[PDB]
Amino acid sequence: SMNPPPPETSNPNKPKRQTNQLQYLLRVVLKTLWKHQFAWPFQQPVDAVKLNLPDYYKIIKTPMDMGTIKKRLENNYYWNAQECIQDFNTMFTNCYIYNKPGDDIVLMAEALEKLFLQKINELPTEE
Ligand SMILES: Cc1nnc2n1-c1sccc1C(c1ccccc1)=NC2
């Protein structure tokens, strides 16, 4: 079995910013989800080999996880908040696409997504 390369977290060619919205996404959004009891499956890329999910990367073509998002935020990979918000939404969507309704992992994603939505609702205006 084989995992794909992880998503990109470093690209010197890509223009970068450190904006107050992106700071909020790290300090509030990421940190809130990261510390949650259901965070652990989402803290690194899905290891399809160890988890014995040989069809995972057949179905999921835009993988994303909070480990990757954490690296992107801490290493200032983004230009804007929308990019990062999209990464979170990709992460949740992948979970719902791959798994069955009511599965434990789906319930975990739903709990994290509820908090995500609560925090993004108060994304500060640009300074
Ligand atoms: C993320 C993600 N998206 N789909 C899956 N996962 C992961 S990544 C580590 C375990 C799981 C699990 C899982 C299953 C039951 C309880 C906790 C995690 N299911 C497969």
With b for 16 or more beta-carbon neighbours within 10 A and e for fewer, the 82-95 pattern comes to eebbebbebbbebb
Residue nearest to atom 11 of ligand 1 (CA): 41
Q: Is 95 touching ligand 1 by the criterion CB < 6 Å? A: yes
Phi-psi region of 122 (alpha: psi -120 to 50; beta: other; left: phi over 0): alpha
CATH topology for the 19-123 domain? Histone Acetyltransferase; Chain A (1.20.920)
Q: Is the CB of 41 under 6 A from ligand 1?
A: yes
- Are 3 and 41 in contact by the 8 Å Cβ rule? The answer is no
Q: Resolution for this model in angstroms, one decimal place? A: 1.5
In the PDB record, what is the listed experimental method? Answer: X-ray
**16 near 83, Cβ under 8 Å?**
no
Ligand 1 pocket mutation pick from 105, 106, 107, 108 by most atoms within 8 angstroms of CB: 105
63 vs 14: CA distance, rounded Å? 20
Residue 82 Cα to ligand 1 middle (Å): 26
